[PDB]
Amino acid sequence: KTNPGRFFEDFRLGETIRHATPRTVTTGDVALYTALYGPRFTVQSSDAFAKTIGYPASPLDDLLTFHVVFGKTVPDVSLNALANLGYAEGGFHRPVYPGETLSTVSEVIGLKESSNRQTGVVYVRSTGSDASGRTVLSYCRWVLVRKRDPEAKIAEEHVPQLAKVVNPADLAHALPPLDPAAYDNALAGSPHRFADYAVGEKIDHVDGMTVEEAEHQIATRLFQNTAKVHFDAVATKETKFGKRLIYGGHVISLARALSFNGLANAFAIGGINAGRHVAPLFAGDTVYAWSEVLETAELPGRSDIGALRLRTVATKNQACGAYPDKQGEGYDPSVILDLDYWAFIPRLEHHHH
Amino acid sequence: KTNPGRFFEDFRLGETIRHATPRTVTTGDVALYTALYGPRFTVQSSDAFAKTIGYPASPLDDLLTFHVVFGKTVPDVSLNALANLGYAEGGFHRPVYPGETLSTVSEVIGLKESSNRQTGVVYVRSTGSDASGRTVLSYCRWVLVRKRDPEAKIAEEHVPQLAKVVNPADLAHALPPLDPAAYDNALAGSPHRFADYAVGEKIDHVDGMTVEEAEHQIATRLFQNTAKVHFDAVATKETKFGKRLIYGGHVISLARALSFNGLANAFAIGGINAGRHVAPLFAGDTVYAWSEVLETAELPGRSDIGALRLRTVATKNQACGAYPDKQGEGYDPSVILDLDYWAFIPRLEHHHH
Amino acid sequence: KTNPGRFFEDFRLGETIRHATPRTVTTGDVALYTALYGPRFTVQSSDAFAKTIGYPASPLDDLLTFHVVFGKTVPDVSLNALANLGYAEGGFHRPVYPGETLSTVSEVIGLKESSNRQTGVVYVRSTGSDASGRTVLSYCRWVLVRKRDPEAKIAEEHVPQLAKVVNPADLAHALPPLDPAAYDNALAGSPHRFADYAVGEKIDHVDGMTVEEAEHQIATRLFQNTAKVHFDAVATKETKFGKRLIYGGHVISLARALSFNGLANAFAIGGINAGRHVAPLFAGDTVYAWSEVLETAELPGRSDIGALRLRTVATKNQACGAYPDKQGEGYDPSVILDLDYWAFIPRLEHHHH
């Protein structure tokens, strides 16, 4: 029963993995998520405010939902990962409330050995469901995993093909009918509505967050994400980094929190277009971030909210006033994340019943 | 939309700031507050105990209420602070329960440039309200803030004038009618009641707490307090301290927790007379504290509880058996906080209906 | 009122201590316990899953119950401890739910001075009760405590005599009637039931956890455990270790979490036979663990669950594939804990009403 877990040669294309340890998310998790990342989006922070605008109660931060659903997959898929690399085709179907239980099922949809035959990239489609089987989250990710025995031979290889953009039209049925007049701009922390954003606008978030060892471990276990490279200062000595790698998701959550400085009314996340973990983060490193409007979509059947398509780029140890990005055939050396996603935002303020 | 925040030259006397991100405080926050500071006051720790003595449920620790209400003001007032300096005229109007939402409004009531023209002291009156607009917390604080451009000229300057003591008579209507017979001294951890304290009594708390980097960051984000000097190990290199300053409130909470060793039945805080952040705390530094009875007040219209006026002084890296205080024209070098406040305490144990 | 606490010479055999600060355990504590230790046992993690199998709601992790009940005793017994040493005769009478309040009473049942006359071992029987006085936890522990004055003389000395095994027959009335068919092996993360374990089976847990300073302090205060040696980087300089000792219970919780890798369906703990803190853990040290089946007991009056008797041994900085244990007259140098306990596990999967 000694189980070092699954390695790259153990995956067979088209297998469905029915992940263990479904997770009841409570106001315990909300309070710890708030203290690990410091997000200040009022919909999630204030029940009073959420209720007035047309929610039943504050919904979970969409990234608390995401890290929990991802977490459940880690024991089977990425326990023996060296790094999670990217995402595509992400959809937040349903908002999630404290007391709800989240479960995850993954489908192996790609496998590509690395040239050294020491590792492969595993591609999965992961689907999270509430206790009654209703989908709440769908996404694709790919992660670089260890082979147990490098001399082993990779049966079938397949780099799958993924939409680099989700279609706003399928995100329309996500958020319940809201009241954009009840939405109190002063309590939400910005006057800027759907119509105040221009395609091409660039936003430095200014604020920096230095990440301590204990912070990312406490976050990573909260998600019940077991990837040994987060936790084992002994074993990681024998990796390329030689020390504990911070959960990629920790950077996504930190960048989202910072993004409140300019995008406070992008209150909920509807889907993920593309994401890429460019570079790893270590304890003692400082995160900064900057964002861009790529599209501004109206939602078929709705006038309360539209959708912003956004690109957010995070750095370590480098302010983003100069908007760091590409630099030759690759990124500026300070870039650690490049995330392309749809958020929701209120439209008009005219009171209706 | 790139916003480095408000600087000293941006404040205009008499402006009202209506702060963003109102905060629903849950049993998540209570559990994290308990783990960040270790307070052992039974009223807050045990619903069973609170209910018996005449509360509807355990109330929030008054400093969890305080750090949340302060927190909401930080983005507008002290995001660009170098240090929060003092308090006066603090009143805990109403106890607060899990599920309640807290909002903050501040009034700029003072401005004084520093001699180097690099900084000014900003004086505010901050008022926290529940979701229905009822006041729960009022206080005055002053914080040393950065000027964006030092060559800038300060229009109007005003060091306001503040009562160095709150009047017990206005704290009477705070706590609901309690049962001081139901109050179980063994469960509360002290036999000492209102009548067992003498004016002039001095209490060393003995216990020390060493504060790690991750602890104060996790606490400071829980309060959604954004002051860059807490978080940015890069930017703080260019400050006088050259490293992250620990939230002043973290020291107040730690000193209050330690104070359980001698003041266990000073179960709730009614108001704040004067407070002064004497000196900063850094990661790795050890806190100790000692307290003094300054007054013992009966409350107009009540026999269940009286009010102790208390002075609590915290040190770093120095036990308080010698009761460190002043030392010439200024404090003993180890002193970091000097806090003068009213707490509540049960009187007589005679059972009534 | 300056109280450095109780020292070895202050205990009198046969005294009952009625401990202060009873503790309401909430979903705040559950979420923080989950993030401090990362346990993935589905009964505790998923209400949905617990309810289906025959609980009213997820019960508290038995070690969250244990650390809280132990915590309440620390101010009186072990505030001035150098190290907690062992356990015997542990019984989890009743599972515990969020909202319940826990109180502790201890009986001094042993005292033995150390040869240097600087310290003694104090032996206690500690009993935790819900708010209505019903017992939930009973155990014996012994801890090495400081004498205030070494020249002091120890009146009565007594090393009591303790059963090295609890009897499965008295654990039968602990867990409510469950449904072992409703128990979803895929959601619980193991197909192995009562009947799949063999006496003599050995299980390496593979996974390692490196423990940071802030992690054990945040955990130790959550339990409201005050032992100065956990917290005071100044005072601990003058101890044999010269630095902060990590709560022994932190190692028990970490080893239990790791043990999910092979014992996922040992879902609840019924009692503790023997436990020994072999060696201390420090910040930066990495924990690993391995377990053994010692007995497999059926429960008088029940067919849903049986009892496994288990031995789990934790190490620091040494993988357990070689199953480290004894090595001459004493343990392998890497061993830090040797814990002998009864857990519960489902039997047959045949659906009944």
Author numbering:
A (entry chain A), B (entry chain A), C (entry chain A): 2 to 354
Sentences from the paper on this structure:
MeaC functions as a mesaconyl-CoA hydratase, reversibly catalyzing mesaconyl-CoA into β-methylmalyl-CoA, by adding one water molecule. The crystal structure of MeMeaC revealed that the enzyme belongs to the MaoC-like dehydratase domain superfamily and functions as a trimer.
To elucidate the molecular mechanism and substrate binding mode of MeMeaC, we determined the crystal structure of the enzyme at a 1.95 Å resolution with Rwork = 20.9% and Rfree = 27.8%, respectively. MeMeaC is composed of an N-terminal subdomain (MeaCN, residue 1~147), a C-terminal subdomain (MeaCC, residue 191~348), and a bridge (MeaCBr, residue 148~190) linking the two subdomains. Although one molecule is present in the asymmetric unit of the crystal structure, the P63 crystallographic symmetry operation of MeMeaC revealed that the enzyme forms a trimer. In our current structure of MeMeaC, we observed that a malic acid molecule, which is used as a main precipitant for the crystallization, is bound at the active site.
